[model samples]
Target: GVDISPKQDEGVLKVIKREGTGTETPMIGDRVFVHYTGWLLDGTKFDSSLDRKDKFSFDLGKGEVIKAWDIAVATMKVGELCRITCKPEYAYGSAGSPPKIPPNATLVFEVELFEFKG
Candidate 1:
């Protein structure tokens, strides 16, 4: 089940899957594997790991990803799937990602945490 409430971060909301069996949540510098789909508020699909047919991996807390992701993924447990909504300030900001995302865009993401490595 996922909770439909705002997370602790302002302008961020989450639907968190509560069934993760893992005891550890990700920490800074940990390498994380996730499958995700990104969208705009109008239900426009911007990107997806599903389309790539593989999970994405990145170092936690690093600027390699969007700032919003750094905050959201840190709270996830392994095998958890979550939907997160992020305000423009936490996303691509006023500049946006260009071509795919617009400036000052509010984005939504469906993310599944597969694993993490320290």
Candidate 2:
């Protein structure tokens, strides 16, 4: 069995694949560009930027997205790729995202940090 330890509290498990460029990490209010795919624990893909053939840009730690995205992406360096498993509370929580994610679903995401500017 895989030992699952939370990176911080009971929120998420972050796995770093490649080290990113530069010494700076994204801070609150910084803008970032990324590509990602989201899946359920069963490996059913719910959403993907790659499928859309477009990269996504958003403000870090701004409550503009989910808690898992803010927490995981902020720890990444520019150009880094990572995988994150989000417990429900850190994801969409009990209500979940409709039509895709079910209530209290655990989510997995493959995320690549492409660019950012503070």
Candidate 3:
């Protein structure tokens, strides 16, 4: 398992699977394509790109998503799968995402990067 978070133990994310084929890792400002699913600590389903039938796309290192993601995603090679465990500071924090995420909730997400381009 690899600790991909920018600072060790800050976001508490780790890699669980690998399918890397010498692909380049994403960097700041790069556009990345990924598949993702998220759950609460108790294993409650929250969201998934697979169910949406489209991949999630985002720019790296832009704070467009959670801090945990900015760190974890940048550390991954294309085709690598990661399981991110996010604490409040790295996620939605004390406020959290309404309806699905509770206040100060801990989260787990499985993310796989498929493609990326700067």
Candidate 4:
């Protein structure tokens, strides 16, 4: 596990686990399944799918998530784990996500990559 940045939208992508049991990486529009623990720089837990039984499933490259996630996650190999650090510019933007996030706030999301579909 090492720290590396795909440098998309100014985010830091750190690997916590090596490439998983495959040689394939998911492309845009692929159905990606994963679990994540989202927190602030102070380690304050904000959101998570880590405790849930079912993995959070979604389509890659869609605007459904943060900007950095699309680049970082898409570049990730199947079964990899990345503890991604992002600024508001690449995450919630200057306005920020409501109810749980604020403006100019930096966030961290440790996501464990899993499977996907064509």
Candidate 5:
């Protein structure tokens, strides 16, 4: 059996509270407006919307983006900042994006959701 016990690491969240109203939240069918910054495990900055000085709008359930993001962002509230840790399985998969992300790479992102258009 795979030992899931030791998988716990520092900064791990113990009591996560889901605030705000889910009714105001967008579903998989909705579009979301968000800004983000990505970082590596060593605290190295990877990417950010601040660099672009603009936010992005995207369809939630589309295959065009990372899967873990789809799961967390759709449930987020406006002006919400959510930290997501994407294991390689939920990221770019076996063939990851080059340079910034390597093959079978996990990802960490600080996603700030700004708008939810249902």
Candidate 6:
């Protein structure tokens, strides 16, 4: 196991786990099944699969989603849930997606690992 020095920005604390099973990390081309809810800094709901009462599946590194999500969710295990706050480095970066995610803004998510077939 390992310890991650906590970091904070805009009143949100970020914790990057240091000792994750590395073995449990999902591969770049692997598909992952997950349940998640995304929110803004002020707690505005941006997206959620829970409303449909279903989990979503996606390719780990297929460029089909946010860079942070592609990278982060790949590092989870079955039944695991985490609260993540993504700084620009791990998110849309300086140029954020509009009509939803803001520019140069950070995002947060409550992620749940439902399962994975591969």
Model 4's lDDT to the true fold? 0.73
Task: Please state the error at residue 76 of candidate 3 in Å.
Answer: 0.6
- Kindly report which residue stretches of model 3 are placed more than 4 angstroms away from their true locations once superposed: 2-8
Model 1, 1-118: lDDT tens digits are 2222255445555686554778688888888988888889889998998678677889986778876788778778878877888887767776778687767766889888888953
Q: For candidate 3, write residues 1-118 as lDDT tens digits.
A: 6543555655656656766765688878888888889889899988998787678888887867877888777777867877877777778874678776766777888988887963
List candidate 6 stretches off by more than 4 Å.
1-23
Q: Where does candidate 6 clash, by residue pair?
A: none
TM-score of each model, in listed order: 0.84, 0.86, 0.85, 0.82, 0.73, 0.70
Predicted candidate 6 versus true structure: per-residue lDDT over 19-115, tens digit per residue: 3332466777787887778888787888898788677778886877666676566557656667766666556666676776766675787777766
Once superposed on the true structure, which residue ranges of model 4 sit more than 4 Å away at CA?
A: 1-9
Candidate 3 Cα lDDT to native: 0.77
Summed backbone clashes in each candidate are 0, 0, 0, 0, 0, 0
lDDT by residue (tens digit), candidate 5, 1-118: 0101123332122112334443477777687877878877678887887788677677887886776666666557766656766666556666776776776544677776777873
Worst ten in a row by lDDT for model 6: 1-10
Q: What are the Cα lDDT values of the candidates? A: 0.76, 0.77, 0.77, 0.73, 0.62, 0.64
TM-score, candidate number 2: 0.86
Q: Compute the lDDT for candidate 6.
A: 0.64
**Relative to the unseen true structure, what is the C-alpha lDDT of residue 90 in candidate 3, on a scale of 0 to 100?**
74
| CA RMSD of each candidate after superposition | 3.0, 2.8, 2.1, 2.5, 5.9, 5.3
Off-target runs (Cα >4 Å) in candidate 2 are 1-8
Residue-level lDDT of model 4, residues 1-118, one tens digit each, is: 4434444435555555566678688887888887888888788987888466566777886878876687677767777776777767667866677787767676788888888853
| Pairs clashing within candidate 4 | none
- Name model 5 segments beyond 4 Å from true: 1-23
